[PDB]
Paper text:
The mitochondrial ATP synthase is a membrane protein complex that generates most of the ATP in eukaryotic cells. The translocation of protons through the membrane-bound Fo part, mediated by subunit a, drives the rotation of a membrane-embedded c-ring and the attached central stalk, which together form the rotor. The torque of the rotor against the stator subunits induces conformational changes in the (αβ)3 headpiece, thereby triggering catalysis. To reveal how the mitochondrial ATP synthase is modulated by lipids and organised into a dimer shaping discoid cristae in Euglenozoan mitochondria, we determined the structure of the ATP synthase dimer from E. gracilis.
The mitochondrial ATP synthase dimer was purified natively from E. gracilis and subjected to cryo-EM structure determination. The atomic model of the entire 2-MDa complex contains 29 different subunits (eight newly identified) and provides a comprehensive description of a markedly distinct mitochondrial ATP synthase dimer, including a previously unseen binding mode of its natural inhibitor protein IF1. The model of the complete mitochondrial ATP synthase contains 29 different proteins, of which 14 are phylum-specific, displaying a distinct architecture, particularly in the membrane region. The interactions between the monomers are expanded, resulting in a 45° dimer angle, compared to ~100° in yeast and mammals. Our atomic model of the E. gracilis mitochondrial ATP synthase shows that in contrast to yeast, subunits a, i/j, k do not contribute to the dimer interface, which instead is formed by species- and phylum-specific subunits and extensions of apparent homologs. The extensive dimer contacts are stacked across three layers: the matrix side, the transmembrane region and the lumenal side. Thus, despite the presence of conserved Fo subunits and the contribution to their extensions to the dimer interface, the E. gracilis mitochondrial ATP synthase displays a fundamentally different dimer architecture, when compared to the yeast, mammalian and Polytomella ATP synthases, suggesting that dimer formation evolved independently in different lineages. Our unsharpened map of the ATP synthase dimer with both monomers in rotational state-1 (IF1pointing towards the C2-axis), shows a continuous density from the C-terminus of IF1. This density extends towards the dimer interface and contacts the all-β-fold formed by subunits b and d, suggesting that also in Euglenozoa both F1 complexes in the ATP synthase dimer may be inhibited by a dimeric IF1. However, in contrast to the mammalian ATP synthase, the specific binding mode of the Euglenozoan IF1 assembly links two monomers within the dimer, rather than between neighbouring dimers.
Residue numbers in the entry:
A (entry chain I): 2 to 98
B (entry chain m), M (entry chain K): 58 to 113
C (entry chain G): 2 to 56
D (entry chain H): 372 to 424
E (entry chain S): 10 to 74
F (entry chain P): 7 to 120
G (entry chain F): 1 to 220
H (entry chain O): 14 to 58
The structure:
Amino acid sequence: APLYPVLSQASLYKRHFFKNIKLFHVVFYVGAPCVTFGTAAWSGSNRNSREAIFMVIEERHGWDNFKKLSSHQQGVIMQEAAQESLLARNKGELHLP
Amino acid sequence: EFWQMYLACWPYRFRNTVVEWETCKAKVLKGSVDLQDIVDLLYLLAWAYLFWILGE
Amino acid sequence: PSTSPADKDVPMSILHTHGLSYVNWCMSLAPGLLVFEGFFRARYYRSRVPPSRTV
Amino acid sequence: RLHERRLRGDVIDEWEELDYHPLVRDDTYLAIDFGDPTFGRYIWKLFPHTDGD
Amino acid sequence: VPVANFRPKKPWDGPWGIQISQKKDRPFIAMWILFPLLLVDHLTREYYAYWHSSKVPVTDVFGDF
Amino acid sequence: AAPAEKPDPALDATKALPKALEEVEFFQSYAVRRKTGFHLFNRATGSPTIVGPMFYNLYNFVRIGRVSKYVCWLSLPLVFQRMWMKNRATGMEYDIDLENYAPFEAKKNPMHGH
Amino acid sequence: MLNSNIYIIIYGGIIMYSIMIIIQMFLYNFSNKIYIEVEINKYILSKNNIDIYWIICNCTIIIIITTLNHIINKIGIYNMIEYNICYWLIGTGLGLYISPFIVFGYKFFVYIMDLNNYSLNIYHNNNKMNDIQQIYNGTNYNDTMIFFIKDINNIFTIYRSINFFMNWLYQMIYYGVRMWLVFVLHSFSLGSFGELITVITDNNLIFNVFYIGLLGLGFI
Amino acid sequence: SPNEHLMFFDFSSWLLVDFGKRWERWVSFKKSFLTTTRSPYWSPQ
Amino acid sequence: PLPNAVVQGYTSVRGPKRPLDHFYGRTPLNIDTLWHWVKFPHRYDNLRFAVCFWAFLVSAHFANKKQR
Amino acid sequence: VYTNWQSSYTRLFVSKPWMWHPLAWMTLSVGIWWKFGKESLCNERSFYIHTHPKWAPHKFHTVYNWSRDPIKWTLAEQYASIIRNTNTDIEAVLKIKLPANAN
Amino acid sequence: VAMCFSSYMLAAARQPNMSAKLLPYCILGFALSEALALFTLLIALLELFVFS
Amino acid sequence: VAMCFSSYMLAAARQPNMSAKLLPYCILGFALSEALALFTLLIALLELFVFS
Amino acid sequence: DMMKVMPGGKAFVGTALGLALFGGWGVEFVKNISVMTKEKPPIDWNNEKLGHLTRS
Amino acid sequence: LIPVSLVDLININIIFYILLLYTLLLFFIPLFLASINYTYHYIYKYYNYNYNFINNN
Ligand SMILES: CCCCCCCCCCCCO[C@@H]1O[C@H](CO)[C@@H](O[C@H]2O[C@H](CO)[C@@H](O)[C@H](O)[C@H]2O)[C@H](O)[C@H]1O
Ligand SMILES: CCCCCCCCCCCCO[C@@H]1O[C@H](CO)[C@@H](O[C@H]2O[C@H](CO)[C@@H](O)[C@H](O)[C@H]2O)[C@H](O)[C@H]1O
Ligand SMILES: COCCOCCOCCOc1ccc(C(C)(C)CC(C)(C)C)cc1
Ligand SMILES: COCCOCCOCCOc1ccc(C(C)(C)CC(C)(C)C)cc1
Ligand SMILES: COCCOCCOCCOc1ccc(C(C)(C)CC(C)(C)C)cc1
């Protein structure tokens, strides 16, 4: 005659899935997508290339004219700016200050 | 060996396109759609969105 | 007051990414995760031996 | 009475199982309230035959 | 006659052990909801300033402006 | 003042290095490989390389992984993207007027500040 | 308007990045507890051991967690947080600095306020004139016409009381700055070497190959 | 870039707070609380 | 480098660890036991081929019409 | 059996100095910011130092764009909103002639 | 820096059993001796990438 | 750099059986001593090919 | 001086009293040691003319 | 370099980081204390009072 709110076997079976995690089971399984689509590899490259691209654009052509042009010519000019930044002809081809 | 099997598998695929389509229609109307079916349909929609971008 | 300018809204595409070098990818420590996930999984699931019969 | 359920194959929670040991449950809860999870020299003093074991 | 040093439970005896387990495993449950939310918060994010930006996102906390 | 404490064996250090060698031996045990399908390019002298014979261990652990072996490779196309874009940029033709007016990260540009 | 004094606060990604640091503490479950127990029982014996022990455990495990997220979970703040001086001075050093003052603050405060009544410490103080000098004159030393200069005396005696609590602050600051410099300079140097090597290989595409190996170099 | 890895550009916005207005509203709230409670001068409040 | 207490995980006494529950009569449910319920997609692969073709084609049609 | 662990966070906090440590940490950090970083960095009179290349290198991911001046135009928009909410006259300030503390 | 590890080597060659108790003092001897080199390296890097 | 290999030499010359357990320390010390020279080299190469 | 060494927090009381009374002037003195040798301008003494205004 | 900056010494963003971290730590302390030791089980099992009786004869 248990006087407490007995918890079902299936409820325990489900809670065991949540509390039987290990440290590596969190670290690696969540770090692989994070490291791949994070500030190191993909998102970082994207979001830090954008800064140089739009700096070059606003210096050479202008942001208003760039917005007025078409998406295709916009992407072309962005690609040229990306090439100029990746090249870094003024830094001796080195991404350092 | 793969080339021969790749060719020979084309009739199976073209035959089972309609079969899989009919079962998917039956599963949606009947509502008898399960987790594995949902996962396969999500994979399908991901690939379809990719090829939509590619077609654009 | 609160604002949401259009300057932050810019075009995005993976084609415009400069990318990474081989050295930067090696320094990204993804290959270490690649190895050590399997290492720690193996250690954990190999510490617990089951019963057996010696033949 | 608790071990009967374990023999049927039912999984018992650690704290549900501790509730069926009420006198140890109380002292264990007070050790948690104090916040000292260390142990062993208390055993080696109350039972000196265990010292070094 | 009953056995000594025994009594019925009272409100100040605190929750049961199963209830303490249900309290413990709530962070472990919210983990599954928050780590994907962390990854989505990082992936669906946009920078706030650029070389061309004439404005910067402002957030009036108390509506004083 | 004069407590006369006996030596405690738990404070000694006679298990850390043995345990580390046990972990390393468990690591190297997964480097055991069969003779069939074995090939390793030696150096020009004929002596083995360093990194060469310790790739099978790493990839045998990659075999045992579950998610990283299907995710961590998606950052590798980005390397070839850079390899291609760099070569495009090494010889890109540009306007002289725009290069003289807006050089990228050049020094002594008053529009930047210095 | 005149009364409006406006202040700008720079706010970024804090909430979701700080939640997972505490949520990971259930997974780590204080693995450093045994080491810190050993060290605390080596260095001190009192009833208030558990307090300082728990404090150090929290600080150290937070350091470890942040370091591992800085090595593995590379997003946003987790990369900068170990390369930043504010974290190394206030998020690790300040807690360890104030921990003994929070555990044994009563005794240290009483000690300091007794050292403001500066006096010479005698071992086996069976002297009577020492007591009369300490009560009547306040100190063993000659306090004649120091009230003439009391204004400086107060603060100087205060420093004289905390001089033996000041090297702790100095060592904390020194080792925090050391860790910051170590992380920053080693990361910068390694990245610089990487960039120079990539420049050499991009200018010589016969070498722009995975020359050590895809996993070998990364694992090393 | 290495400095790009030693950089934190994960900001979201700028929270602007008129501390003068906030101090004024704090004082007004204190006055309103003391008037509603009708508290005397000798109160700890 | 580190003491034996830190290596073995205890200063004086090794504490007993409660073993893992098994739930007799059913499969284990862990983060690593999920392929038992969710295999790789295998049911709608041919439909995937067909739908990818149709998606590409319809997208190309509407894109060309928009551009023209 | 009664426990502050499950029935009173206040008495739990009071009975454990190692719970007071984070609160004192928070208070000290906020006091440090209030004393040093508030007026020197966050105030509008002291916010332009974030454009400095020596004391705030690449706070905007680049060198600061002075031709654009986002700080200037943001704050000008905010002051304009303040002026419109208060219905203050712009040109009333120009009619003032302050005296000098002669002698 | 290398003096420390040379000392640890020869000390363990005199007594292998003590190699575990001296190894803390070996690591302790490295990071400190290495630190000053880093501080010497700081100024030269503080000298260029901030000053014009 | 050579002080580490010299130390390993004399250590094995006093105890050959311990040669296997000290070789990891030997490689570790060579790299650390070599790294400081390598760090010093970065300034010299950074001083020329970028600065005008 | 003889109340400082008394028990009952009288050391803290004496030290804090010495601070509140004389140590503030001592802090000001220490700040002014590197001010005495420095060139300072003449004091712009207030003309005590600005501020008067009839009541209404 | 970027981290060599007086702005990054009293960074309010990191101060908010620390604030949120230790508020959550304070909230979750009573769950960190919920680990069980088996010392009172031992004391119950092994504590045996003297059960012999007195017999003058
Ligand atoms: C026993 C060895 C003795 C020799 C010691 C050699 C010094 C080793 C220093 C190790 C510490 C360096 O710290 C490490 O720096 C690298 C390089 O930026 C960072 O790496 C990060 O920045 C680089 C720089 O481009 C990116 O390419 C990369 O994708 C990213 O992960 C790591 O995230 C950080 O963990
Ligand atoms: C080597 C040069 C000198 C530096 C020496 C110090 C290096 C320290 C860094 C390595 C730290 C490894 O930290 C390691 O953490 C794990 C947790 O996973 C601890 O693990 C410990 O606790 C767990 C549970 O909490 C027990 O089950 C286990 O039996 C026990 O080993 C290890 O005892 C500790 O050694
Ligand atoms: C030289 O070592 C390099 C490997 O370092 C990898 C860093 O990994 C981060 C933490 O990884 C883990 C994960 C789990 C664990 C265990 C399994 C021991 C956790 C435990 C104690 C909870 C069982 C240990 C380390
Ligand atoms: C958590 O820390 C443990 C990590 O330990 C990693 C040690 O790394 C070295 C392993 O790499 C090797 C080296 C050599 C070898 C084998 C090549 C021993 C030599 C052999 C197989 C020819 C005898 C295998 C793997
Ligand atoms: C890729 O995977 C993402 C989603 O994963 C879902 C995994 O779901 C498996 C759920 O496990 C079960 C299975 C059966 C059951 C029941 C209650 C139906 C079993 C029963 C009736 C035998 C008690 C409960 C949980």
